[PDB]
């Protein structure tokens, strides 16, 4: 990110907390109280449901 | 181009409607070929150039 | 060119997020969207551009 | 299908009036539904994955 005048260098570790996380934290699903994820499938117009 | 033909810079909100923002010379200064000399362009030295 | 630059910079949209947005701190209780709209509507605001 | 085509034509006619910001994002024309046909949830019985 920057090199200080004394030669010291600052990186994303020094100013942030890099971490693998979700794109968005808005939606949280639970199945019978257990942490879970799912797909909400919508039928296309004029298609057989079965 | 901006002085003689005009330029659509960006938009603005008026009474909840997006409207364009144009800039152009006031008509007095873009009517005759002699009006070319009235326009100055800044140089790297900071001196306006006819 | 300077007029164009100023006009482009003046009007914009800011995705300012929310107070208490996800992921929230434990115990958070207020979630409000942040609105920072430095938009110019009438003529005088445009004339007042630095 | 013809309805979608006509809607796309009208949307193309109306797009330039829209703000440039929303034009960059890209507008979507899709056949729509209202209710989920099926919800398929995924859980991890080992309680290892959040």
CA distance D20 to C5: 17
Q: Which residue of A has its CA nearest to D45?
A: A34
Of B7, B2, B37, B42, the closest CA to residue B22 belongs to: B7
Q: How was this structure determined?
A: cryo-EM
- The reported resolution of this PDB entry, expressed in Å, is 3.0
**H/E run at residue D4:** helix D2-14
Candidates D29, D30, D42, partner chain A, best to mutate (most A CBs within 10 A): D42
Give Dmax over CA atoms of chain C in angstroms.
51
- Count Cβ atoms below 10 Å from residue C10 Cβ, excluding itself: 19
Residues of chain B with C-beta less than 8 angstroms from the C-beta of D20: 10-11
Closest CA to A47 of D4, D37, D39: D37
Single out the residue of B28, B21, B12, B19 nearest to residue B4, CA to CA: B28
Instruction: Note which residues in 1-50 of chain C have CB less than 8 A from chain B.
Output: 1, 3-4, 7-8, 11, 39-42, 46
Give the dihedral sign, CA C24/C28/C33/C38. negative
Closest CA to D27 of D39, D42, D15: D15
Interface test with C, best of A25, A27, A28 (most C CBs within 10 A): A25
Cβ pair C31, C18 in contact under 8 A = yes
CA–CA distance, C36 with C17 (Å, rounded to integer)? 10
Positions of E strands within C1-50 = 18-19, 32-33
**Backbone angles phi and psi of A3, in degrees to 5:** -115, 120
């Amino acid at each position: 990110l920057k090199v200080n005048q004394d030669g010291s260098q600052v990186r994303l570790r020094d100013v942030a907390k890099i971490e693998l996380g979700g794109e968005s934290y808005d939606v949280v699903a639970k199945f019978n109280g257990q942490p879970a994820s799912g797909l909400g499938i919508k039928l296309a117009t004029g298609a057989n449901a079965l | 181009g901006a002085a003689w033909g005009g330029s659509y810079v960006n938009d603005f909100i008026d009474r909840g409607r997006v409207k364009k923002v144009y800039i152009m010379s006031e008509a007095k200064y873009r009517m005759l070929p002699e009006d070319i000399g009235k326009w100055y362009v800044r140089g790297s030295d900071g001196q306006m150039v006819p | 060119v300077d007029v164009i630059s100023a006009l482009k910079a003046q009007n914009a949209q800011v995705a300012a997020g929310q107070l208490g947005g996800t992921p929230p701190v434990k115990g958070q209780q207020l979630n409000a969207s942040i609105i920072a709209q430095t938009r110019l509507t009438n003529t005088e605001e445009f004339g007042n551009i630095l | 299908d013809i309805a979608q085509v006509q809607v796309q034509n009208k949307l193309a006619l109306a797009t330039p009036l829209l703000p440039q910001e929303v034009q960059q994002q890209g507008i979507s024309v899709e056949k729509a539904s209202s209710s989920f046909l099926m919800v398929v949830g995924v859980i991890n019985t080992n309680g290892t994955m959040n």
